[PDB]
Amino acid sequence: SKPQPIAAANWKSGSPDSLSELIDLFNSTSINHDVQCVVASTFVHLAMTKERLSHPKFVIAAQNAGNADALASLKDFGVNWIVLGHSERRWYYGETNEIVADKVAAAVASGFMVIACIGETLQERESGRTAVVVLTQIAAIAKKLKKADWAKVVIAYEPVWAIGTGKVATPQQAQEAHALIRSWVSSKIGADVAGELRILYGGSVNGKNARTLYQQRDVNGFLVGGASLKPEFVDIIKATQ
Amino acid sequence: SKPQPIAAANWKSGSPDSLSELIDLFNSTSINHDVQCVVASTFVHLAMTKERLSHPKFVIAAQNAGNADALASLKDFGVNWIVLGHSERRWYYGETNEIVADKVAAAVASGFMVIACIGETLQERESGRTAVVVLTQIAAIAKKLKKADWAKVVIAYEPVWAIGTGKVATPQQAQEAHALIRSWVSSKIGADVAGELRILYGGSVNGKNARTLYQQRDVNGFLVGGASLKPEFVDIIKATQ
């Protein structure tokens, strides 16, 4: 039915010691279903996790790449997944739809599994421009990808207003945005591709809200920030059953 | 007499929780005089404050912009004020008078209210080169601004040796530098402009020293770093009466 789900952690902060305790918990956790778990972080924690994380279902990812040289070095360092187009890169650092599109194409060429992020601001949401915004973002990425490349792409839909604010989208809001993105992909690229495509939801996900969100027809997992620094991340992974 | 004063906070560090407590304190504080309050920060706290800060007298600002795309995105994100040419950008990152001048011109074009920072090092101060340094910095900015643009500019004078060191300038030192900058502007651009111009003082300002500094004829407010992370920032705002 639904493609293999992904439960990605976005370690935006935390201390080396507290984090290794988490890694121990994960390593000792049996997941009785097929799900790809991803732990994304910065150089600070990347060396530790790359060596301390042993769970068969987990993989590590870099939080961003500034250029082709970094993609190359990261690849050599042994990192195969990467998160691109995350909120702040777009609104704080000014990366345009075109720029992240180029980054996504480059990463894929270098052989990475890419989690490309998209989402609208509170202003856009309220102005009723969600659908146009989201599709423009996704369209920019598509313009640079060859049909084969989609095999290496995961889309993460995160309303900018839901990230770190405590304000999660509703099962209906998420499902609608995801359904829209999938439709666009199906009609523009192919239904074969659209069906294989994982579209994750990110924006204040936690152990208590995950299942309802996951139950939606078009939600294939989550990109989790805050709750991924806590052991409740385990409940979030179990919610992708 | 003096133009409307500005009490700007420069949140260089701090935790999300501690910071929201401050925002609550601010939001519940009545200021019985006309003053523009500004809370400047990085992407980390910018999303929270933009949503949690409700005080009618407060506005939020970005701590820097790396290029035109960032100015555009920030503008769209809903940020209208920006701090440029701050100490570290000049001495640590190597931004020249010319570069920050260009940044100031660009920001103004994009529609921002700009706090352009200037100031000399301890070496320069001691070598007795304060006046030449400060004027060269300001002159570089002027070379790129059209007379109309000055309406969107606020100048912050912060001796590099006073920032974060605990070593504040004396009411006489600040007043002299401010008087000099205003004179230059008056004779080079116009007295109309010079009079409307807010020149703030920054460099180890606190609740205890603010009033004396503010009492000077040419001091129009403060850019505060350390003390802005504490509730004494309220006393600093009251000092602009």
Task: Please give the Cα distance from A145 to B66 (Å, whole number).
Answer: 28
B5 Cβ neighbours under 8 A, 6+ residues apart: B34, B35, B36, B198, B214, B220, B221, B240
Within 10 angstroms of residue A33's Cβ, the number of other Cβ atoms is 11
Interface test with B, best of A42, A87, A92 (most B CBs within 10 A): A92
Which residues of A are marked as active site?
86, 158
In the block, tokens 């190597």 appear at: B94
Q: How many CA atoms does the CB half-sphere of B116 hold within 13 Å?
A: 33
Four-residue CA torsion sign, A156, A94, B44, A136? negative
CA distance A3 to chain B (A): 33
Picking from B78, B32, B20, the residue whose alpha carbon sits closest to that of residue B57 is: B32
DSSP state at residue B83:
E
DSSP state, residue A109: H
Selection from B46, B47, B51 nearest residue B64 by Cα: B46
Q: What is the distance between the alpha carbons of residues B205 and B209, in angstroms, rounded to a whole number? A: 6
Gap between the Cα atoms of B236 and B224, Å rounded: 9
Phi/psi of residue B22, nearest 5 degrees: -60, -50
Residue B74: which of A91, A99, A122 has the nearest Cβ?
A91
Residues B62, B66, B69: CA angle, nearest 5 degrees: 90
Nearest CA in chain B to A123: B77
Which stretches within chain A are classed as H helix? 16-27, 43-52, 68-77, 87-91, 97-109, 122-126, 130-142, 171-188, 191-196, 210-215, 233-238
Chain A residues closer than 8 Å to B68 by CB = 94
- As a whole number of angstroms, the distance between CA A58 and CA A38 comes to 6
What are B109's two structure tokens? 């074009």
Rg for chain B, CA atoms, rounded: 17
Spatial distance between the Cα atoms of A239 and B55, rounded to a whole number of angstroms: 41
Contact A91 B69 (CB under 8 A): no
B178 token code pair: 């401010």
Catalytic residue among B95, B120, B124, B158: B158
b/e map of A150-189 (b: 16 or more CB within 10 Å)?
Answer: bebbbbbbbbbbbbbbeebbebebbbbbbebbbebbeeee
Sequence-separated (6 or more) residues with CB below 8 Å from residue B188: B139, B142
What element of type H or E holds B89? helix B87-91
The torsion angles phi and psi of B10, rounded to 5 degrees, stand at: -120, 85
Q: Which of B123, B114, B220, B225 is nearest to B168 (CA)?
A: B225
Other CB atoms within 10 Å distance of the CB of residue A34: 10
Cβ separation A165–B48 shorter than 8 A: yes
Select the residue from A10, A64, A91 to test the B interface by mutation, using most B Cβ atoms within 10 A.
A91
* Cα–Cα distance list, B230 to B56, B206, B208, B235 (Å): 20, 10, 13, 10
Q: Answer yes or no: B86 catalytic.
A: yes
Give the residues across from A60 on adjacent strands: A39
Binding residues of B for substrate: 10, 12
Domains of chain A: residue spans and CATH: 1-241 (3.20.20.70)
The answer to whether B9 and B40 are in contact (CB under 8 A) is: yes
If you ran DSSP here, which 8-state letter would residue B85 be given? S
Chain B residue with minimal CA distance to A98?
Answer: B69
3-state secondary structure of A159: coil
Spot the catalytic one: B86, B95, B120, B124: B86
Which residue, B214, B205, B204, B203, is CA-closest to B239? Answer: B214
Q: How far apart are the first and last CA of chain B?
A: 12
Residue B131 in tokens: 């006046």
Which of B51, B68, B70 faces A93 most closely, judged by CB atoms?
A: B70
Residue type, B29: T
Kindly list the residues from chain B whose CB atom is less than 8 angstroms away from the CB atom of residue A160. 47
Q: Which long-range contacts (CB under 8 A, 24 or more apart) does B166-175 make?
A: B166/B204, B167/B203, B167/B204, B168/B203, B168/B204, B168/B205, B168/B206, B168/B209, B168/B213, B169/B201, B169/B203, B169/B213, B171/B212, B171/B213, B171/B215, B171/B216, B174/B201, B174/B213, B174/B216, B174/B219, B175/B216, B175/B217, B175/B218, B175/B219
Reference B202, options B133, B108, B115; nearest CA is B115
Which candidate, B88, B25, B73, places its Cα nearest to that of B52? B25
Cα–Cα distance, A163 to B100 (Å, whole number): 32
Residue B134 to residue A26: CA distance in whole angstroms: 56
A122 token code pair: 């509170």
Q: Minimal CA–CA distance to A89: which of A109, A62, A110?
A: A62
- Tokens read off for A163: 């990230």
CB contact under 8 A, B74 and A88: no
Chain B partners of A88 at a C-beta cutoff of 8 Å?
43
Q: How far is B201 from chain A (nearest CA, A)?
A: 27
A144 is in an annotated binding site: no
Sequence-ordered list of residues with C-beta below 8 angstroms from that of B220, at least 6 positions apart, any chain: B2, B3, B5, B6, B197, B198, B199, B200
- Measured between alpha carbons, how far is B228 from B226 in angstroms, rounded to an integer? 5
Determine phi and psi for A146, rounding to 5 degrees: -90, 150
CA distance A41 to chain B (A): 16
Count how many Cα atoms sit within 13 Å of the Cα of residue A106 in the half-sphere of its side chain: 19
Q: How far apart are CA A85 and CA A156, in angstroms?
A: 10
Q: Is B199 helix (H, G, I), strand (E, B) or coil?
A: strand
Experimental method: X-ray
Collect all residues of chain B within an 8 Å Cβ-Cβ radius of residue A123: 76, 78
Q: DSSP assignment, residue A66?
A: S
Q: How far is CA A93 from the centre of its chain?
A: 19
Q: Which residue of A has its CA nearest to B77?
A: A91
Which residues of chain A lie closer than 8 angstroms to B73, CB-CB? Answer: 90-94
**A91–B76 CB contact, under 8 Å:** yes
Closest CA to A94 of B65, B158, B98, B236: B65
> Which amino acid, A184?
W
> What is the token pair recorded at B66?
């790396």
Q: Which residues of B touch A90 (CB under 8 A)?
A: 73
Q: What tokens does A17 get?
A: 């010691």
Q: What does this entry list as its resolution, in Å?
A: 2.6
Neighbouring C-beta atoms of residue A196, cutoff 10 Å? 13
